[PDB]
Every structure is written in structure tokens, then in C-alpha cells.
Design a protein around this ligand. Structure first.
Ligand SMILES: [Ca+2]
Ligand SMILES: [Ca+2]
Ligand SMILES: [Ca+2]
Length: 296
């Protein structure tokens, strides 16, 4: 089964480097063409940071692509971090990378793929559950292994290191030398919790969308891997972290949405913390891979 990847720029398709398959820029859209002897699948990968101008061109270009194949192709719109399982398979055992001093977050959950995501170069970008690669300007750096991190995540870390041509030293959470903190611009408190720090998978995080835009108040679960963009800016979100239940309130939620979210989390039963948008604590933010604090 043939795989072809085009980067969209600036009003058309430019072929992405064959070696760079799986390496995507966050501010860009990509057209991934999968051809099997029977039909076709077009994955339109849209970066969480791509401008709406690119989002339109990407959609226009997959239509152009589909029409040139006969209109026979299945078209699947993929948001950054919401890739259907069949896609992540087209990246043959190499992990997905999503892009002078740089910090990458490495995460694998409940199979899927190892996902590598570039994050802000702050200490509070850190996360006890995942592995991190800190690339320094001198082409060296640190692989920081969180306390609840998997071996697969360490392998992902080691992979980015080689893509970045970076000479890494391996350090463990709690055993950081003092230059590690200096390179992140000081030691702060990062994303961490009793359950984050344990690699346990027994009670995985579950996210629900609570809304009343349909008249009745309905709580529905977010399917698959969830990310930041799954947080409905105009509704209320329930995150059952097992040890804790978060109620995330969007800037545009009803007052009824808010107050019935409480009634329902108290039916869903352990602390129950209410969280304002843009005011999310590191303990909540940690359950997401990357967390672009500066979207909205
Ligand atoms: Ca761009
Ligand atoms: Ca992890
Ligand atoms: Ca609403």
C-alpha cells in the first residue's frame, strides 16, 4: 500500500521529503494519500496552529486530489492529535513528530502510536507521566524521564534526539542536575499528581461534553484520544481523572450548563474541582499531550 504526503504551501501541493514522513509542522496542513489496489483514502491533516487560510486551501486541494482520482476516494479530515488508527499505521514503526532551545513531549497511551509534540520551553511544560527531550543550542541536551513513563516513550524520545541530531544525557524526575533547570529558565512546579506519576492504566482519564444547545441538558463522552481542541469553548467539560473530577467551564457556557454539571458529577459518584477556561491548573492540564496555553 503506497503512502504519499504533500505539504500544503502556499496555494498548492509541495512534496514532503521521503525521510521526513511523520514529521509535521503544527502551523501547517498536510495531504496524506493512501492507495490500496481497490480504492483510495485521503487524510487531510490539519495542524492545531494552521491559519484558517491554510485550512481552506487544504480542503480545496483534497477535493482537487479526489476529483483527479475519479471522486472515488474516501476523505477524512484529521485534526492534530485525532488521527484514526489506520492512519498512524502508515508510519511504519517510526513515531509521529509534530513541530534554538527546544522542548519535546513524548507520549504513548493504551496502544495507538507514540506521539512526539513540541511544547513551550518552560518547566511547567513538564509532566510526570511522559518523557521529554530538551534540545540545547549547542546540539546536545537532556532526555528527562518522568516517574510514570513507559519504555516505549523513552524510545520515542531517543528517536527525536536523532532527528534533531542531538547528543542527549538521560536524567530522571527527582534526580535532575542543576543545569537542566537553568536551561528551562528556572525550576517551577510542573504538571504532576499521584496518579500522573504512576504509569497505571487501570482507570484512564475520561472526558465528557456537557451542553444544552439542544434544549435538554445532555452529557456525552469524547471518543478516542482527546486533546485541547476537544474542549468546547461554549460548553462545560467533565474530566473524570479517577482520583479527581474536573469541571472545566468554557467562557461561553450557560449558567444552567455550569450548575447541572455539578449535579451530574455528584451523580457520577473524591474531590471535585471547578475550573475556569485559561485558568486551568497543571494537575488538569497534564492529562493532555501538549497544552498550548496561548490559543484563544
Ligand atoms: Ca504556515
Ligand atoms: Ca506517559
Ligand atoms: Ca452551551
Amino acid at each position: 500500500g503506497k503512502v504519499e504526503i504533500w505539504r500544503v504551501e502556499n496555494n498548492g501541493r509541495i512534496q514532503v521529503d521521503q525521510n521526513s514522513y511523520g514529521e509535521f509542522y503544527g502551523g501547517d496542513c498536510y495531504i496524506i494519500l493512501y492507495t490500496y489496489p481497490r480504492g483510495q483514502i485521503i487524510y487531510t491533516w490539519q495542524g492545531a496552529n494552521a491559519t484558517r487560510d491554510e485550512l481552506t486551501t487544504s480542503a480545496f486541494l483534497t477535493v482537487q486530489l479526489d476529483r483527479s482520482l475519479g471522486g472515488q476516494a474516501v476523505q477524512i479530515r484529521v485534526s492534530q492529535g485525532k488521527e484514526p488508527v489506520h492512519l498512524l499505521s502508515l508510519f511504519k514503526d517510526k513515531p509521529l513528530i509534530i513541530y534554538p532551545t527546544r522542548l519535546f513531549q513524548v507520549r504513548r497511551n493504551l496502544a495507538s502510536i507514540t506521539r512526539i509534540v513540541e511544547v513551550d520551553v518552560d518547566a511547567n511544560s513538564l509532566n510526570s507521566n511522559d518523557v521529554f527531550v530538551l534540545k540545547l543550542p549547542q546540539n546536545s541536551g537532556y532526555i528527562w524521564v518522568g516517574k510514570g513513563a513507559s519504555q516505549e516513550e523513552e524510545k520515542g524520545a531517543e528517536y527525536v534526539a536523532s532527528v534533531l541530531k542531538c547528543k542527549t544525557l538521560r536524567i530522571q524526575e527527582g534526580e535532575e542536575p542543576e543545569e537542566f533547570w537553568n536551561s528551562l529558565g528556572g525550576k517551577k512546579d510542573y504538571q504532576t499528581s499521584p496518579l500522573l506519576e504512576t504509569q497505571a492504566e487501570d482507570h484512564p482519564p475520561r472526558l465528557y461534553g456537557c451542553s444544552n444547545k439542544t434544549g435538554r441538558f445532555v452529557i456525552e463522552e469524547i471518543p478516542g484520544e482527546f486533546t485541547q481542541d476537544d474542549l468546547a469553548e461554549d460548553d462545560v467539560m467533565l474530566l473524570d481523572a479517577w482520583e479527581q473530577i474536573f469541571i472545566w467551564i468554557g467562557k461561553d457556557a450557560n449558567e444552567v450548563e455550569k450548575k447541572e454539571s455539578l449535579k451530574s458529577a455528584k451523580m457520577y459518584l473524591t474531590p471535585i474541582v471547578i475550573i475556569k477556561q485559561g485558568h486551568e491548573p497543571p494537575t488538569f492540564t497534564g492529562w493532555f499531550l501538549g497544552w498550548d496555553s496561548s490559543k484563544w
